[PDB]
Enzyme design. Structure first.
Site, PDB file in Angstrom:
ATOM      1  N   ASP A 149      -7.229  -1.790  -5.370  1.00 29.64           N
ATOM      2  CA  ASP A 149      -6.303  -2.549  -4.517  1.00 29.64           C
ATOM      3  C   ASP A 149      -6.089  -1.918  -3.141  1.00 29.64           C
ATOM      4  O   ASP A 149      -5.974  -2.641  -2.146  1.00 29.64           O
ATOM      5  CB  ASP A 149      -4.944  -2.707  -5.213  1.00 29.64           C
ATOM      6  CG  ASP A 149      -5.040  -3.519  -6.506  1.00 29.64           C
ATOM      7  OD1 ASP A 149      -5.974  -4.333  -6.639  1.00 29.64           O
ATOM      8  OD2 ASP A 149      -4.196  -3.319  -7.411  1.00 29.64           O
ATOM      9  N   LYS A 206       0.294  -3.049  -9.398  1.00 25.69           N
ATOM     10  CA  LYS A 206       0.295  -3.630 -10.741  1.00 25.69           C
ATOM     11  C   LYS A 206       1.690  -4.095 -11.129  1.00 25.69           C
ATOM     12  O   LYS A 206       2.673  -3.834 -10.407  1.00 25.69           O
ATOM     13  CB  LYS A 206      -0.210  -2.641 -11.791  1.00 25.69           C
ATOM     14  CG  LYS A 206      -1.622  -2.122 -11.589  1.00 25.69           C
ATOM     15  CD  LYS A 206      -2.689  -3.210 -11.828  1.00 25.69           C
ATOM     16  CE  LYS A 206      -3.847  -3.003 -10.864  1.00 25.69           C
ATOM     17  NZ  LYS A 206      -4.859  -4.063 -10.956  1.00 25.69           N
ATOM     18  N   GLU A 220      -3.389   1.617  -7.004  1.00 29.70           N
ATOM     19  CA  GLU A 220      -3.453   0.360  -7.735  1.00 29.70           C
ATOM     20  C   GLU A 220      -2.076  -0.277  -7.691  1.00 29.70           C
ATOM     21  O   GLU A 220      -1.079   0.410  -7.933  1.00 29.70           O
ATOM     22  CB  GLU A 220      -3.890   0.608  -9.173  1.00 29.70           C
ATOM     23  CG  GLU A 220      -5.385   0.824  -9.292  1.00 29.70           C
ATOM     24  CD  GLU A 220      -6.154  -0.460  -9.026  1.00 29.70           C
ATOM     25  OE1 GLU A 220      -6.287  -1.285  -9.966  1.00 29.70           O
ATOM     26  OE2 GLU A 220      -6.589  -0.650  -7.873  1.00 29.70           O
TER      27      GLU A 220
END
Lengths: 226, 239, 223, 238, 239, 221
Positions: free
Chosen positions: D72, D105, D103
């Site tokens: 990401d 999430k 990341e």
């Protein structure tokens, strides 16, 4: 150290354009030419409904113009053929005007600018969905080679090319301090420190009179593909 | 030649997009192909579209507070329409500004056709106002909303015979509700379809990207500009 | 859901603007209009441009400096200016907004003077004009009453000369007003920015696009 | 005053980020029907970080042709490093150019810690060359690569105690493998952690974002610039 | 010739800037109904300076929470230095990142030299940390800070003799306090000065802008890059 | 595989460049196509643009299609994209874009390079040789970059002012002398080889050295 007197809106308008006129002349006199300088200025000036860049005009029959220094065209309604700044590939139906940048205005460069204009005006413009208008064409240079300036011999040079509407040069600018156009039928000529502001506002007036390029069915560009 | 350069420009872009979408696939634990990154498709269709269109990833919202699902590529107006103080990559777009919605998925198969259709329905169910601002001495233009265009963009087509009979039967099944209709689609491997002319028209090969884009452009053109509406319907409910 | 995210997307920007303008007020010169410009520029439809500058007319007269001119660039040429110091023809102007420390009598009168300096300019008809919108943006409202009796009397006062009328204003602490519907309408609280911006957009919408005039009136007196 | 303006400049962006990420988590059905949208986080960390750092979604590649998983938010160099002819939103990044991977999430819990550690391993396992131009023995210090920083950004923290006992036990377990270590994390609800000082340091509340970002910058700054290497290793096999 | 094009490039920009500041003077009644608009100066010095330097209007802040006054043109680092989540036109700049500050004023006279000096002092009084980050081996390189450069930009000089005897005495008087020292200045009508060579050097005429810019470049170059320090001093007091 | 994606990305851009440069040849080439790609590829420490190189003694080069130069430490002489006015001490490399690699255009590109290398670069505060090259659509010889080519290139490179270090034909050929010996590649990886070899050569030059820019103003009054 200059004594600067108090300025008003009219003098600031004049200086804003005339100082850019001087800048462009310095820039062009060096590159003896690089059209980038001119492109910056006319792009900054024009209403955002107009785009301007160097490139090639194409039609739906696959024919192309010569390379054009400054194409004034639409991007608001018109797709981009996956090109990028400095190297455009422009549908003919999007084109308002074409300008050629040269070192000087003489007979050789007027003929060359007219050659360029004709390579654009000969292209096919569809009416599938229209009232197409004539493409405006012109020349931009530093100076004018004739003792006369834009005088007797210059006017005589347009008259002999008057016959062919595809080679017509509607307007021109010598940033040393002269411009012309035939937007009012008669050839109107100006000289001096306001040549650039005159050229730009007269061109905007002509573009305005033409209105927006007519909306057309762009799928004529894919009709012969498989 | 001008026509060959036109063909090559778009076909080389088609190949670039295929390669990037493949490069972007997530790694799965079940050996399947994985999900894809929409951003390069966005840059291409943004470059292509006339500037009257904006396109970005985001969520569509309406004046009653409902939202769509996330859409990879919303084609929408910004010339007449305010922004809701959003950002590149996550737009928050009033429903009355939306022309079309496209989802970028790994492959054209039953799963992703249904998924793209569900996304399309989540936008088409949103309420679009017909309220307009006071027009005092002017001739009133009655707001006539057009149907939002929806489609799918993918790497390839799972059907061995491509966009054939089984695909077409699936598309019709999906599109038997107007909210879920998929008007168009592109597989950058080399296929595209649309129902812009009612009959499904399908193309294959090197010109799939150029056909998909010009066909979409012609459909958009037929919709006109989104109708002007009174944006204050968005503040009428607030304290 | 969507209404709460709508409210938050504007209210958090209102708070960001109040924070920046509050800082600027303690540091001070004039309060810095930059954050406000960036927000209203982000909000407005792209048919509108917004920047700091000076308005000019074809007879050579200029306005005072204006913190935020809302104007056209789709149809209007640029007089070779640049961001932060625009030199804008009067016939392209939709609205002017002054950013000041507070909404009080002194700064209302100041904003009204700025508005008159724009509205006095000549707009050509060569080829009917709408009244330019004018307003004030500030951190807070000086009266402990808020936009109350003393405010209404003072707004009413400046707005008796049509050149000086202030149509609208915003206090980013949490207040806004406008006279778009004739009656002065006041809002308070967390949604003042979103109200100000959407109401301003509705007013702009009603004005229509600036009329296409013959820009060569700006060169007719040059030699 | 200045300190109050500093706090508000970051805390109000923390609130804006929390608002958008919460919306995205709901609309993706908790990161099951879609990926939590990292766009607001990318814009903020890009704006904050010194220009020597670039940040984008992408995939990391090495000179042996191995690729990481999709990431990401890769923090990487573009001042000394070539671009592999990509565009914003999906970068194809050489491993020698990477500082950090993050990341974004739905939540911090065992599942997404393990997922993020697996992503970090897919990057840290890539080969980073120590080859340099003009590699004459004795004329320069050999290249010494630093450990890539990895972390997780999420909406909130699922555990009953927040970033407490179960969290630290989970973190230590995934982090027992250097390839899988998670150096840091941010829950935009208002908590952050890092192991930059060995001890797990946790912050909570209105300053979670400013702490996360300044602590991350301090760690990055301690690594120095990515070592200059011979990019022609990427063509030597062709 | 390249040398003439160099001269004209800079002198035409000098005339352009003089013209814009001349208008701003007239519009603001010599800075009495508003401040002279610094943004045309900003655009030019931003265009000129090497990209290692950033320039903008804003406020300088330090890790103790103190702030400077508003500064028209701060020259500062962004390559190694974080941003405090600010925006163009209103930067909020850590003091350790600052190379120089310049104030745009209506004219060079005693009043505005003193005003520019007070602005400079409000920046130089700010605390710059010497705390430095240890590397992976536990070692930090100590740093030392340089003095910040300050100056004044205006359309012209009020004194009859320009940058002559009265100007020099006033510049020396202001600059006898290092906090308030004005190292350099430009009157865009055609005069500049600096004390970079530990003596006041003055130029006048059509080359004032190019002299001012190249001399400032040389001064900046002598300072080197801002020292690398531990930005976490900015968060040490927060809970 | 990552190397396949790497190869495909560059080769597809090679094909696009060939198609673009080929259209501006049939009509007459437009360098802006190439500028965009090399700018996108190069690390941000490099700038690249069309323009003119100048020195502190007022002399100028010819117009250069693609100058690779510094802007991180170097001032801008108030120019704009598409026509830069670049101090000689800021220059790493120059590249001329021409229809074909043949004797005529090799000589023309060598001439352009000499007009840059002849310029004075101050040492007031040692200089690296500027890199010069040619970029073209195709190669005239049926040999490709054959024995004729190397003979012609080493003839041009008898004068260091005129040396062409490198070149690219986007039809599928590239060369350089970075390792003294002339090294030639052909086929679909010509672009990626040219760009990474150039990058390696640039890396070896280091950053343009810091100089005392006051030499550009010393003679002005």
């Amino acid at each position: 150290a200059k004594k600067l007197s108090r300025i008003n809106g009219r003098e600031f308008l004049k200086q804003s354009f005339n100082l850019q006129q001087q800048l462009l002349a310095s820039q062009l006199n060096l590159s003896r030419v690089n059209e980038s300088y001119f492109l910056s200025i006319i792009r900054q000036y024009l209403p955002e409904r107009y785009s301007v860049d160097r490139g090639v005009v194409v039609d739906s029959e696959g024919q192309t113009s010569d390379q054009i220094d400054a194409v004034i065209f639409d991007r608001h309604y018109t797709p981009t053929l996956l090109d990028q700044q400095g190297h455009r590939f422009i549908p003919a139906e999007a084109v308002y005007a074409v300008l050629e940048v040269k070192p000087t205005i003489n007979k050789t460069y007027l003929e060359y600018a007219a050659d360029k204009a004709a390579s654009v005006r000969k292209l096919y413009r569809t009416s599938t969905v229209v009232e197409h208008f004539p493409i405006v064409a012109g020349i931009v240079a530093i100076d004018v080679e004739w003792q006369d300036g834009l005088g007797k011999a210059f006017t005589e040079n347009l008259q002999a090319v008057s016959s062919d509407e595809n080679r017509k040069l509607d307007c021109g600018l010598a940033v040393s301090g002269a411009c012309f156009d035939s937007y009012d039928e008669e050839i109107k000529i100006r000289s001096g420190e306001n040549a650039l502001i005159f050229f730009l506002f007269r061109l905007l007036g002509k573009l305005q009179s033409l209105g927006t390029v007519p909306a057309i069915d762009w799928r004529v560009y894919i009709d012969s593909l498989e």
